[PDB]
Subunit: 513 residues, 4 copies
């Protein structure tokens, strides 16, 4: 994430705006864009003004059925296509995403409310997801040999697991959808994507791009719609054995329960209440920058947000105070403005839920230091009452509080004190979640020690969340299961096969002799 | 041959026969949790917010 | 002098028994399943470094004994490399079991022969047993590798196979531990062996052969030839039936061996010299750092390849820290190997003492400041006269990294302390030698630690601790310290050969020629 | 003779142009980022294997040129090994891209210089581009290894670092493909390079240097020194600043190089000679087998290291099968490298043709039965006079595995057919060679195929097919065919150094010494 990002021309922005309201965002099924059979659609708001940006086809079980059949029918040929050819398609898709980057940026900025200074990197990462997994396509069947002396040869290989139903969140539509779509396609599987209803546009755009890449029909399908309708239908469909989910923990339970009906394989990346542990001996200037960014970037709407700030008592007053002042100075404004740091939340219904947590925090004794209410003015004087803007918020509280135990998914931070390493660790792990954790300290042994004991899928020492694609990404506890990233994704998208064969006449027990 | 097993190999089924694998290192993917630990070797670039 | 009824858990009676058998029984070669002398009948003596008296004699092997040993290993390779891994595993476990049963004898024998304190040698016997117990578990995985399927058209898979007989040439400081370090993997991976141990401490090897025979290894699988490096050693390196060679010794010996090995393009796995540095920063736990650097250079009588012979200390604490190193070295108890109070014993041979003292003199003449030691130990901690043994006082110099005592391996209890003003300079000086075996870094700063770990040219880096090994990790050095690696699966790359097997799943296109 | 308007998709005009450029421009060295001649001004010529006339000349490099190249590689190593992997990947992809851009010129140049059929050289250029595009994807994984945590007390982890400047010494048969096979991985993994190409076909190498300069590699990262093996070659092997060495050539050269490399304990990755056998069983798809064995020995003018120079055929089908091989060989079209209908071109140099004829003669006096060929090809399939070129007729002998023609590498279109009574014998004869590069088995029986694949002493075994490669697999030989492996992650073991880093998670126990 660069310190400065270029703006998109006024004309391009205006062109994207009219194209969104000019034509409904349709499903992509069996190689073509189509509306729901009912003809029904649903609207998607522009979080900066709460005005309708456009509408998308309202898919149900009928559209999902057609999509699942299409994916199933195309699985035979796609899984048998040469890896080198699948690689070519993915690299092409990566190329085209870069070519349409400005469009995608505007689209997600207006639809999801993320700032351009974040969205540009997201679009770049979306293309990268394809370029990255394109190099794994040719290694997708590889595993091991287990020879036994000169008597037997056992060898293992991997084969595409089958159609994948990808259910994605609304915070980073393109980024988190391509993150699952790329490996799925690379590994020989077909796909049915069901985008979050609160930000469906970039998905239809992605479909246009995959069509421009001339991906075979049925290989990639898209079905816009509500989770309770198109979503639930996808989870229940007999022809889609694999499901990836990125959302709330409770949604994971619902999806898993319904998935049992067909013993489906699930790869869920759920919520989190990732802690940031700041020790007195750390580089406090870097720690301040990291913590402020890790909770307020993405408008605080990201699973790896450091929503709990554990600070060593001896520096609690000074450090937390510096965090408050920084949050106070955060530039709140329109997403398209390249200067904006924090934009509006996704939907008024989400802003309501977040305000609900703020209020609950007050009622339970948490000490509100800054924010905690709707933003009225931007950093440029603009009136922001029409959008879903929340001021960056900082509370001082106790780890057992509701606002410290439940995911808020908003720019709300809770600062909690700890007397020593043992207590910092205890409090850090005392959560139902376990996605990420951040530790700021200069002591070598303390750092690695905490990294080993912190119950999280990812631990970042002395920095914010900086990712390296080949590493296993995922959570423990209530944050999900399974891992994405390089070869680790292989374990979910493919099946292992052990093939055995004797090198000479083996001993075969005699029965009925 | 008939079913002759070598314990280190991944054992399990596909479709209606189950999921996951048992056997040597493959058992590890089920009984254990992976963890990725990151750390910079020199002052990294951290985006500035509220400066 | 009977210092106690038991030392390192060994009865004094056992100690005297072992000493007596060494003088009574010549150490013979073990060839084609039998103990035999050299055809010439010649033998060579081995001294007791504590008194320089003859402990006993060992057969002086030459080209003829080596030829017979190589033929035996070669002839037996055919059957041994095809034995079931489970069966080889059984043998290694039996060997480990028998080493443990003869532990007291082995400890005393090597102690008397090589001069290390008995308790340390006893712990080394345990490590030797562990070497076999460890690799016993890799035997059944020795053929394993990967599959590289190509869509539905081809299947490529790889396997590993025993590479061939291994000539194992070892040093005089730790006979049992260093020889079993190579023998165990060689055998586990299906190869036969011909061991040629250092001539200054031959006894333990003949004893080891006795044990392998007690384990009932097939004839020819393990062979032993005692003798001088230029005789038995060079003959083994030159023999056409021993394709693999492991060498643990001096860097210069590595050059001579490689040159000789070229005639048959032999595969070599050398673990050579070292001049490993210890870098102590002002922000580290100085109490632990002090314990570590003192131990890392003076333990094992300074005759340890991974010894931190160069101590780099940040300037702002140089005077105080180095001063503390000096007082600790001054307090080190020097005495007989069989005395439980001894911390530093005698060097291996008078010739080695003359060489080490030669370096001490080189240091004095080049401007190095001698702070302690620098000459023979006259009296033991108990007031005994030590003039008959090869005892050297723990020695500490303050010098510069360009000095000869800083650049060349002394292989004795001699340390050279060198200052550095900052991280950049600490790293530059650390890497400025022709060696690259180990390195030790003492600092509490997370980023500086990993940064230096990545930049230090060494096969092994230890952060905030002395040398503590974990067998599965790759062990070896860079630069003049050798090449290749030992340890778990890493050893496989040397002892086995990779093979890529390909087969089409359907009729492939064969270019048409002459059709 | 203008054979056509276009050959291998290349216009005759382009062919003529490349040909005259060679006569006008001497092939210079590329040192420290600039093309330079030898300080002495000396040069040596390269012949056109089709007419034995001088195509052009190349600078005759010696010790002074190698010294300058080694220093440049050394000096550049510091920064190059520290460049970001993503940036090195960009460079390799740029090189790959530029190789394709200059593909026609490279194809013609090497065709003219080394004598292979133009379309085959053109295909080889595509493989050279692929070498860079392939390793480009490994650059970012070059430091990766493992973690070996020990409970909650220790963390041991391993990484890999660039090993150092690499001296690449290559053969004359396939200049571009074989040099890039080593250059690509060397650069991808952070090492600098000094290339010393075979003197019989130097042009392509200088062209490759022009291309790398076009890709704008930093000065000193890639250096080239033209010259003879005993001059520039030996100088490179002996230079102290080039720690790693790749050699692709004859086994005898490997011995000489290893001996010379001993002086600085250099790491060698040799791919040497071979006498790869093809085993044909009565139950195999004999039509595919026939196409496969004919191609595997006669393609590439028989100058391919993996050529199946020995044909082992089961007795009951020996007469029929070998008879068919003979007729196919008789039908092979011998002609000029630029003639689209040519199947077999001229050998590299008159000295080589004579060397091959020497073996043909030796085989006859030896008792081998010549079935076809066995002498110079004086007339092409079009009736042209080929007497001024180095053309050999595809040759087929029936002999015994112990014969010199069966034991020694001829490196030409010469085949030796040998019979076998059964699997046991086929395996015995197949392995009874001082070589062990490749092996080909033709049989439909599952268990026999895998059984033979496991027992055949070769680095690569192909079942029911000719030589079809998959880059990620380990490529190399055993016995006299070399050591080490190239290909994907296997090349890492040679181009990088492993490092084990250890750190305690809590205060460890350091043995108390001197207190
Ligand atoms: N890297 C390691 O792991 C490691 C471990 C232990 C000891 N060492 C090193 O070993 C050295 C101690 O060596 P040493 O005194 O035994 O030296 P050394 O090299 O002379 O002895 C090693 C072996 O080499 C044999 N040898 C000597 N000349 C030979 C020749 N021309 N041909 C064939 N064999 C020959 C000897 O007989 C002996 O068995 C030190 O430099 C120490 O650092 C290294
Ligand atoms: N294993 C493989 O992958 C592979 C691939 C291609 C060719 N080959 C083998 O290479 C051979 C063809 O070899 P060639 O005719 O180029 O032979 P060669 O060994 O004489 O030439 C190889 C390189 O060695 C250099 N050289 C020669 N003498 C030298 C010395 N004293 N010091 C340093 N360098 C020296 C030469 O200048 C040349 O660049 C065949 O035996 C073939 O089997 C093997
Ligand atoms: Na929206
Ligand atoms: Na001795
Ligand atoms: Na020595
Ligand atoms: Na030529
Ligand atoms: Na040659």
């Amino acid at each position: 994430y660069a310190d400065r990002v270029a703006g998109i021309s006024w004309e391009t922005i205006e062109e994207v705006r009219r194209r969104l309201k000019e034509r409904p965002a349709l499903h992509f099924i069996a190689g073509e864009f189509v509306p729901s059979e009912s003809g029904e659609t649903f609207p998607s708001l522009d979080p900066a003004t709460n005005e309708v940006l456009g509408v998308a086809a309202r898919g149900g079980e009928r559209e999902v059925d057609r999509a699942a059949k299409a994916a199933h029918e195309a699985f035979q040929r796609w899984s048998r296509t040469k890896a080198k050819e699948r690689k070519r398609y993915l690299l092409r898709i990566a190329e085209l995403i870069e070519k349409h980057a400005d469009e995608l940026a505007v689209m997600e900025c207006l639809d999801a409310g993320q700032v351009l200074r974040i969205v540009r990197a997201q679009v770049a990462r979306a293309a990268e997801n394809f370029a990255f997994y394109a190099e794994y396509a040719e290694h997708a069947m590889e595993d091991r040999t287990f020879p036994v002396d000169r008597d037997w040869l056992y060898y293992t290989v991997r084969v595409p697991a089958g159609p994948v139903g990808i259910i994605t969140p609304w915070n980073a539509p393109l980024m988190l959808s391509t993150w699952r779509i790329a490996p799925a396609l690379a590994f020989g599987n077909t796909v049915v994507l069901k985008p979050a209803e609160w930000s469906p546009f970039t998905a239809t755009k992605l479909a246009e791009i995959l069509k421009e890449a001339d991906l075979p029909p049925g290989v990639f399908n898209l079905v816009q719609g509500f989770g309770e309708e198109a979503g639930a239908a996808l989870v229940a469909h007999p022809l889609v054995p694999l499901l990836t989910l990125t959302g709330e923990t409770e949604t994971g339970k619902i999806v898993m329960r319904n998935a049992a009906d067909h013993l489906k394989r699930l790869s869920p990346e759920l919520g989190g209440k990732s802690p940031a542990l700041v020790f007195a001996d750390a580089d406090l200037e870097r720690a301040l920058d990291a913590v402020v960014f890790q909770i307020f970037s993405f408008n605080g709407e990201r699973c790896t947000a450091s929503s709990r700030l554990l600070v060593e008592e001896k520096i609690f007053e000074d450090f937390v105070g510096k965090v408050v002042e920084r949050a106070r100075a955060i530039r709140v404004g329109h997403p398209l403005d390249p200067e904006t740091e924090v934009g509006p939340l996704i939907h008024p219904e989400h802003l309501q839920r977040v305000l609900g947590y703020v209020e609950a925090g007050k009622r339970e004794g948490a000490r509100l230091l800054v924010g905690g209410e709707r933003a009225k003015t931007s950093f440029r004087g603009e009136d922001l009452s029409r959008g879903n803007y929340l001021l960056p918020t900082v509370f001082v509280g106790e780890n057992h509080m509701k606002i410290a135990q439940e995911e808020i998914f908003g720019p709300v931070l809770v600062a909690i004190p700890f007397k020593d390493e043992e207590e910092a660790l205890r409090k850090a792990n005392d959560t139902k979640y376990g996605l990420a954790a951040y530790v700021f300290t200069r002591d070598l042994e303390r750092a690695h020690r905490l990294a080993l004991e912190l119950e999280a899928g990812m631990v970042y020492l002395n920095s914010h969340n900086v990712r390296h694609l080949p590493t296993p990404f995922g959570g423990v506890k209530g944050s999900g299961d399974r891992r994405e990233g390089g070869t680790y994704a292989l374990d979910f998208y493919t099946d292992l096969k052990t093939i055995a064969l004797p090198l000479r006449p083996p001993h075969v027990p005699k029965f009925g002799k």
